[model samples]
Target: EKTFHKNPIIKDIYTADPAPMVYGDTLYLYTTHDEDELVNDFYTMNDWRCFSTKDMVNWTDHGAIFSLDDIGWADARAWAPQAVERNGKFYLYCPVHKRNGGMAIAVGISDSPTGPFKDLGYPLVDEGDWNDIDPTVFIDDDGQAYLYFGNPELRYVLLNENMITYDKEVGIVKVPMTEEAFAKGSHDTGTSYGEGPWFYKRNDLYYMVYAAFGVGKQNEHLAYSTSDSPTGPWKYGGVLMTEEGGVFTNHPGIADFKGHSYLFYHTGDLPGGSLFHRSVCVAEFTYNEDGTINPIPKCDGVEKIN
Candidate 1:
């Protein structure tokens, strides 16, 4: 069975911030649902949606596998999540807003990748910082997991073997805003570090890709950095995605499923779209022979899985 597809992969509704959890022969997509109706000129979301595909073209929508409806205290603003399997259970780390003030990171537990996940009672990390939202988690080959989160300034912390808890044990590292990030004059390419840090490993390299301003729609372009270590003294790797023909905000997640590397992102490519309403998209990418990622463009139409 073979199929081929194009962009705005899911048209029935709006989806954003596509996170990937590689499960066996399938790649599970955990995404943020951008509610069509906007309230107070900002985005509103009810649940974090799910979708998956073994092939690039045909997709199966799981419809908010991570939801507020399943839990007693689940916040309605449960959005921008990252999930990973640990010890045979799925753990979803999400930025759920606290009514008192800012955002916090909440943990959702599920046995299935398509989950009716339940919160782990309280938040895992909530320090009342504006950068507290948009949590992205990754585990190294050594069985150590790290949570890299925040906006304005990027930060990362080591998670315990439990994956849901972290203490003062291994402290937080604020990713440096270096000259390389600012060295380019393309959009203020290094002027700032925005939200959505998706961390992963490729070969001997540690890659951190996130939304930033370098080149559009709000000056946000998808950029990346590489380091020798997970807790990096990093070197900027320029832009992986351009800030062109897209929404004001952009997020990047990477996964190698079925032996091909795919970069996940979002845009306002839907009909009657707004910055508040977005859709998820993915394109195949390959690393340079030297481990540098050549900047990726959108789907070229009817591409094949390698």
Candidate 2:
């Protein structure tokens, strides 16, 4: 019984910036909702959406779980977001534009995975910088938590057990973007670290996967770096996904379910799809014997896991 599913998993509505969270037996997906109305040529997103699946072939829509209407400080631009569970609660780290100026990272709390998450009212970290977007949180095997975010630059801070607060004493540590740490090519042709980062740990090795450029292409492709420690002396891992899927910008979300690993990304492949009206999709992948990942093609998705 090989039930198959197509790319752009959720077809009813436009979604982008996929963030996947695996809790219990279900895989919960959080995404940036691209509004139908277009006010300009750029992105016009206002809310966040949720969906889940136990088997890879069929997905259940949870609809708009949270939105800009719930956030007071933000006037527009609900970009990439990530969710992680701590204790019995679910915490969502979101990046939105502040009404005053720049960008801020906010936290939302929920008791359930498919949530009516409550905004924490104010941001957890506000550096008043536009690059302070695409927040990804990771908790190591020892229970040490860290929050990583930013674009054109990579930065992180140690998070307390509370998950909402961080160690102010250590401040924000900027991950070195030296050609040796992230760039895989020579001076100009090497992979340039772009926006939207996804951080996770597989075995003892830590992975920093993000949207990157300059890997034999002009558009964004998913590339990564690996470090022994969460805060890294990182080594460039090379391109994870080279296919464009039809859009210029791409975001990555990686998770392991059952015994398999999957990669979730965004593309403008649907009928009305465009640079702004993008859609989220996924592909099943495997790690090499040495734990490095090969480039996954954006083709027919995966078969039913059940």
Candidate 3:
């Protein structure tokens, strides 16, 4: 029930599709930096950077962690990145547009929270068969790890102890379109278009939060599902938040700080514009006794946890 000022938590860089990792007391945010107009610019690219902040008010920019030229795989459009820390090293997982106009996930490693990261030579999971973007890594309490991604189809795979390669077979999950979501769609695509998959666990229940509809307008918002395990028999939870004017809105990244939960997402200032151009915002989350999260309202400002 606490409300705080909602300033641009991250400013002036055209950053979108943020994936954050918490290390000790610091939060490391990595996102898609598409300076060039290439669709697949992960290779031969420069200026893919990372930012670190301790208090969420002050940020320290760590410039140019990896360039497209350094990694021979992936396209230049290095977008929607997520990172995880394991075994005293930081791992960055990103979706890259491949040279053939497909998508792939690439891994890079760094020694520090803000890093001079080095690519692992090649992509850890490059299945040229499907459009794989928005890479999120979830490490469970038992130390087991899983990777989640998808744009056309929701996908999940288990990872090895090193947290580098996919160790198990990949499984697919689809977003179901409800009548309300269908009425909000503008494109010919189905109502269940999913993006920005983030994994979190609360009270022993596993939740997957993602963006549906489109990003860049006021109608965009977050949706989620729950399961007992990482490999899910998931039951869908409907729209978490939607904005006015039916514009592109809501692309979420969920996190827990101290004992509180927060939903981090973006909203477009105008209709049918780039949601990436929108600034980042946060709101507090309340949960039911059964571990189901209540739908978040369209928040007007940020709520700082401390």
Candidate 4:
């Protein structure tokens, strides 16, 4: 057996809601830094931090990529972010706290992955008062792209080729959440908090991997669903994981690295009552013959990737 060990991997303090990208042989991680003090501060970490590791065991930090002050509209609380490289340019999509209403997803672009990224001027998608956060970009097989986000329920809209702007021709579609889903932690009924959506295609199925509840609590776990198209009838696949230490694990992000798919989530065993602080961890995932993912077991010493 190829025994694998769990490593902190990247230990940038106060880093949460991580979105990682791999370019060439190097890996770059972008996360919310939660620095809200500076005026015009983006609340989240400035410029997404860059970390590179040829082997997953070791990492080299590349420092700030973009800061909230750099982008005029953002107000620090820039949460869960996702980065995608399209047509040689890298696009980072994230949620920013709005002044009056709910959250909005903001766009920042850069020529390089480790970037001095400049904001695209304004938020790419703001659906009125509808609380949009944790944006994930999915470019379908037919070259059509869509942006997926939501809290209590999942919603999606079509995006233009630039992967930033929304197409007016397409309207929003709400991915249904059953009562059972909420009971199982698929939807956050109490505080309205489903987040960290990562979209991917496997075996002709569109899989949206996401997290629910709050991070650092045992209720935080990875869950996912499948649909034939990016915007259609989504079928819940059930719980992927629960809090490892007790009951507080949150913010799961999924990616396929080196031909295998892995689930990335966070857990906290720190002394204080702070359940929001967590560390990133990854686990191996397997798919059923029908393309549905199997549930991940709860254990401290499980081998995540082999």
Best by TM-score: 2
**lDDT values for all models:** 0.78, 0.87, 0.65, 0.65
**Residue clash pairs of candidate 1:** 181-190, 186-214, 187-214, 189-214, 216-219
List runs of model 1 lying over 4 Å from the truth. Answer: 69-76, 181-190, 215-217, 300-306
Q: TM-score of predicted model 4? A: 0.82
lDDT of 1 by residue, 203-235 (tens): 889887888775333567888888898888777
Better of 2 and 3 by lDDT: 2
Higher-scoring candidate on TM-score, 3 or 4: 4
Write the residue-wise lDDT of candidate 2 on 1-306 in tens digits: 549888889887889999999999999999998777877767889889999999888789998888888988888889899999999999999998888988889899999987898889988888877878999999999999999998878889898999889999998888877777678532242447887888888888999998887745667888898999889898888888885555888899999999888999989887788888999999998999888988888867788885
lDDT of 2 at 162: 90
- What's each prediction's TM-score? 0.92, 0.95, 0.80, 0.82
**What TM-score does candidate 2 get on C-alpha atoms?**
0.95
The prediction achieving the highest lDDT against the true structure is 2
Clashes of each: 5, 1, 22, 18
Kindly report the root-mean-square deviation of model 1 from the true structure over all alpha carbons. 2.5
Off by over 4 Å in 4: 1-5, 34-47, 179-193, 213-218, 246-249, 269-273, 298-306
Extract clashing residue pairs from model 2. Answer: 185-190
Ranking of candidates on lDDT, top first: 2, 1, 4, 3
Question: Predictions ranked by TM-score, top down?
Answer: 2, 1, 4, 3
- Worst 10-residue stretch by lDDT in candidate 2? 184-193
Error of 3 at 227 (Å): 0.7
